[PDB]
Design an enzyme around this catalytic site. Structure first.
Site, PDB file in Angstrom:
ATOM      1  N   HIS A  41      29.877 -49.560 -10.025  1.00  0.00           N
ATOM      2  CA  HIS A  41      29.129 -49.511  -8.790  1.00  0.00           C
ATOM      3  C   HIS A  41      29.954 -48.801  -7.692  1.00  0.00           C
ATOM      4  CE1 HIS A  41      30.912 -53.507  -8.083  1.00  0.00           C
ATOM      5  NE2 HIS A  41      30.658 -53.076  -6.730  1.00  0.00           N
ATOM      6  N   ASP A  84      29.852 -53.077 -15.701  1.00  0.00           N
ATOM      7  CA  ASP A  84      30.191 -52.475 -14.386  1.00  0.00           C
ATOM      8  C   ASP A  84      31.630 -52.057 -14.307  1.00  0.00           C
ATOM      9  OD1 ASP A  84      30.060 -51.773 -11.746  1.00  0.00           O
ATOM     10  OD2 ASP A  84      30.055 -53.808 -10.949  1.00  0.00           O
ATOM     11  N   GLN A 177      32.970 -57.970  -0.080  1.00  0.00           N
ATOM     12  CA  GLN A 177      32.689 -56.564   0.074  1.00  0.00           C
ATOM     13  C   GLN A 177      33.921 -55.778   0.437  1.00  0.00           C
ATOM     14  OE1 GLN A 177      29.642 -59.016   0.463  1.00  0.00           O
ATOM     15  NE2 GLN A 177      29.777 -57.990  -1.283  1.00  0.00           N
ATOM     16  N   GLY A 178      34.165 -54.738  -0.319  1.00  0.00           N
ATOM     17  CA  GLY A 178      35.342 -53.896  -0.316  1.00  0.00           C
ATOM     18  C   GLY A 178      36.367 -54.276  -1.382  1.00  0.00           C
ATOM     19  N   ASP A 179      36.200 -55.407  -2.034  1.00  0.00           N
ATOM     20  CA  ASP A 179      37.108 -55.781  -3.114  1.00  0.00           C
ATOM     21  C   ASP A 179      36.597 -55.286  -4.456  1.00  0.00           C
ATOM     22  OD1 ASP A 179      39.012 -57.352  -1.662  1.00  0.00           O
ATOM     23  OD2 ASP A 179      37.581 -59.057  -1.617  1.00  0.00           O
ATOM     24  N   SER A 180      35.331 -54.791  -4.541  1.00  0.00           N
ATOM     25  CA  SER A 180      34.789 -54.382  -5.808  1.00  0.00           C
ATOM     26  C   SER A 180      35.682 -53.367  -6.510  1.00  0.00           C
ATOM     27  CB  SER A 180      33.402 -53.738  -5.611  1.00  0.00           C
ATOM     28  OG  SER A 180      32.431 -54.785  -5.354  1.00  0.00           O
TER      29      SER A 180
END
Length: 224
Positions: A41, A84, A177-180
């Site tokens: 993603h 993913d 959010q931003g750690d993905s």
């Protein structure tokens, strides 16, 4: 990272920050000198020139070695939240030494064991919906959540064996959010997954969901 602490130098020698458009975006794991493992993603469908990787630093803005991307390979069966992972090839090699090293992958066919302690790291939000994104790396330790419970939480169809879950039942510790794309490791710092998805961040009874290295090793091994 929600409910975390400051990472120390050398805690994750293989971790990379991935910026997009010059801004914070994702994390990843350095597999070897020219290869990063991240979440699909993070990169699927996006212009690959917008990305930059940084390795060898606790900061996502300064220090270490940077590279642009030569190519992106998303998992062939990436579908919805499933499968993913993506393999990035780097235009600048990143030699190991100092605080740079390469990830040790979880054994093929392995699944993280319920109740065991896992550590996830990144430069993402420190609260759900949070405005501030950390310059210096944070980390948090959470238990693996059994897939049966994760399926109670999200629906059986939503959690596959290519995913695993981690978090605390009463909320407050999680990736966000931003750690993905960044790493989740076992207690020995073996890479067991990449931050993937979840219903918000750190919510009680909605575990963090991770792409499973043990289940995805045949894509990782072939293109790394």
């Amino acid at each position: 990272i929600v409910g975390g602490t400051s990472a120390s130098a050398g805690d994750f020698p293989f971790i990379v920050s991935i910026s997009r458009n010059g801004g914070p975006w994702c994390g990843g794991s350095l597999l070897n000198a020219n290869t990063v493992l991240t979440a699909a993603h993070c990169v699927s469908g996006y212009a690959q020139s917008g990305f930059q990787i940084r390795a060898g630093s606790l900061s996502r803005t300064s220090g270490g070695i940077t590279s642009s991307l030569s190519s992106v390979r998303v998992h062939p069966s990436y579908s919805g939240n499933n499968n993913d992972l993506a393999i990035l090839k780097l235009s600048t090699s990143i030699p190991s030494g100092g605080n740079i090293g390469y990830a040790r992958l979880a054994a093929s066919g392995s699944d993280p064991v319920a109740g065991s302690s896992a550590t996830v790291a990144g430069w993402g939000a420190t609260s759900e919906g949070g405005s501030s994104t950390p310059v210096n790396l944070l980390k948090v330790t959470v238990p693996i959540v059994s897939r049966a419970t994760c399926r109670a939480q999200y629906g059986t169809s939503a959690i596959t064996n290519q995913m695993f879950c981690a978090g605390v039942s009463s909320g407050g510790k999680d990736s966000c959010q931003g750690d993905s794309g960044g790493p989740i490791v076992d207690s020995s710092n073996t890479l067991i997954g990449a931050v993937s998805w979840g219903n918000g961040c750190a919510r009680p009874n909605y575990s963090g969901v991770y792409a499973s290295v043990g289940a995805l090793r045949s894509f990782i091994d072939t293109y790394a």
